[model samples]
Target: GLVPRHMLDGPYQPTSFNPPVNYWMLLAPLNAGVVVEGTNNTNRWLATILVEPGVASTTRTYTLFGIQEQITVENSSNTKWKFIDLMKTTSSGTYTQHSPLLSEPKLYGIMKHGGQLWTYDGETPNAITNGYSTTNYDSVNMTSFCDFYIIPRSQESVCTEYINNG
Candidate 1:
């Protein structure tokens, strides 16, 4: 809906594996520039999100091998992201957080603390019947976003600040 639908057709299949992720790097919008990098020393640290994984079972957190680690959906450390709604769109909905600890449902626009806009996706996957296993996958689309990262509580302050400012 935000980014064109064609960009996500081939290699960039819908949302992450399933149940969505608990935290992830919010990429720069394609309109801004499609280049993104993920390294310990890169400012990319500022481009991440704290996810709540919309699947509320808390017992079975979905995961994709090589995509991200399994998120323990308990009320312990960094595991609370409430769903927020962005302004509705025509063909699809949009929503994303503007600061740390902000939550969202699936497939929405995420405005960051720095005034950057990112997209969040938790739209339920299309059930596909297969030969061996059946899996849920989102058939939507965005920026060159990165994998999830556990933002340390000590750095929550920095995470909440605009990268260009702080």
Candidate 2:
């Protein structure tokens, strides 16, 4: 399921999607996992859902790793983020970047349990090399490589309190 449209983005933080371009919302499903265990686990980047401006009658769903779709991801930005592959998780069980795929140019305000956010500055070194069999991916060049930028951190405690007592 997705986050209720009205309850996402705005008010969560002073985010990229906060104002006019807040037409889209990101959703980490009830069962989605983090990058902690790599592909050995079911965790992956969350999905995005279009709210008001982009679609009508039916909300459109876009997976971070979907095939053949150009998703600019961030609001009011030219850079795009495509899910490459699951990356390792941090020692604290949080994600700094998208993983082996990395955030293409960058990603900000990544949503989590309590509106947790993270960022990437879209720096160079581009991406990490995932040396493995590409038997399951569409293209290794796109799936295993991406811009080199670490995942940004967010205020996890802000959301923790909300969920703990909500």
Candidate 3:
């Protein structure tokens, strides 16, 4: 079920969404097992979701891999981390190394907005704001309100965690 709206602190209070959950939040990948390319073929990364069996006591850990790239913000002098697919060119031809995962497997906070999942940057809410830009990404640059959830690290398994309201 979707989380209720009242439970969230709204965009105006972005920082309040923190310190709620003790486990990581898991969002189903936008396109499982697919590669999404950035603007002008500049970057590419594999998209995926966390998959786990419903077995009661079996625990497992997963690792995320991606090509590392640096992104320079338009107005800022600082750079950010961008993850993309690893490309390798061999003697015969060029091939892509498929690694369907985020640059960092852990998420701080997440919520649904306009039918898309948005991640909080602690100070502001950025819709699907990873390191790259896409039509699917947007900035809420306003003091609005909405429902949200906190993501914490999993103890038993490094890659496994459940989503819950703060």
Better of 1 and 3 by TM-score: 1
TM-scores, one per candidate: 0.21, 0.19, 0.19
- Tens digits of per-residue lDDT, candidate 1, 6-83, equal 001112422332222222232222211112211112111212223443434353222221133233332232332432
lDDT for each residue of candidate 3 in 1-166, tens digit (9 for 90 to 100): 8965511222232221222223323332221121122111223222222222222332222222233332211111122212223333222223343322232322233322342333322111121332323223222111112222333333313212221111
TM-score of 1: 0.21
Model 2 TM-score?
A: 0.19
lDDT ranking, best first: 3, 1, 2
Error of 1 at 96 (Å): 16
Clashes of each: 9, 5, 4
Model 1: lDDT to the true structure: 0.25
Query: Distance (Å) between predicted and true CA of 52, model 1?
Result: 10
